[PDB]
């Protein structure tokens, strides 16, 4: 049936998690290792818009201490 618009598993095989928002910690940790750093966008099969915009939103999130900045912080 028409207009269902983003039920599940639909638009993309890997879901876009955020766009440019960074205030929830859990959407951000969707692509952040236990070492405390981003997985490459070729590996994740993420959509480019959300990733390009994440490069600003993660630097932001590290700077507001929602995330570890650095390997030393375990």
């Amino acid at each position: 049936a028409r207009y269902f618009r983003r039920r599940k598993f639909c638009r993309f095989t890997a879901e876009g998690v955020q766009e440019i928002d960074y205030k929830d910690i859990a959407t951000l940790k969707n692509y952040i290792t236990e070492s405390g750093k981003i997985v490459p966008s070729r590996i994740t099969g993420t959509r480019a818009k959300y990733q390009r915009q994440l490069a600003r939103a993660i630097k932001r999130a590290r700077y507001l201490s929602l995330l570890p900045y650095t390997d030393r912080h375990q």
């Binding site: 440019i20 205030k23 910690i25 507001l64 201490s65 900045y69 912080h73």
Partner: protein, 135 residues
């Protein structure tokens, strides 16, 4: 006007200062015909790494619109604020003032996982629970 999504945190012991400061900053936004489009208090949270020392800070997402002229004076005042440890404000382009990614986690904080203590009573006095001095 243009939209600037400010989020900030405040040093625990110094949190009693912000409840006076917030009511001038909001008068400088609505006195210029801007709006405060949510004003969400997050409660006390644990820093991952310290910022200006101490492992704790008290979280506020204000969610502003104001003309470009006014926010420039108001941000330089917040950054040289001793109460604020850090703030980040995000770009205008394609920016949301509704439908919070953290909407459930904000309610959870407030309901069940907060401090329930006097420095985080002050944080809510600068939060949605605003108590403010007369002008």
């Amino acid at each position: 006007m243009r939209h600037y999504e400010i989020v900030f945190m405040v040093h625990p012991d110094q949190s009693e200062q912000v409840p006076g400061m917030i009511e001038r900053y909001t008068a400088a936004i609505t006195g210029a015909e801007g709006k405060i489009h949510r004003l969400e208090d997050w409660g006390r949270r644990q820093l991952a790494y310290p910022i200006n020392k101490l492992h704790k800070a008290h979280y506020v997402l204000m969610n502003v619109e104001a003309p470009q002229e006014v926010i420039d004076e108001l941000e330089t005042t917040f950054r040289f604020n001793d109460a604020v440890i850090r703030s980040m404000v995000m770009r205008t382009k394609h920016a949301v003032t509704e439908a919070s990614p953290m909407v459930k986690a904000k309610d959870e904080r407030r309901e069940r996982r907060d401090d329930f203590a006097n420095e985080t009573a002050d944080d809510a006095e600068a939060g949605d629970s605003e108590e403010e001095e007369e002008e």
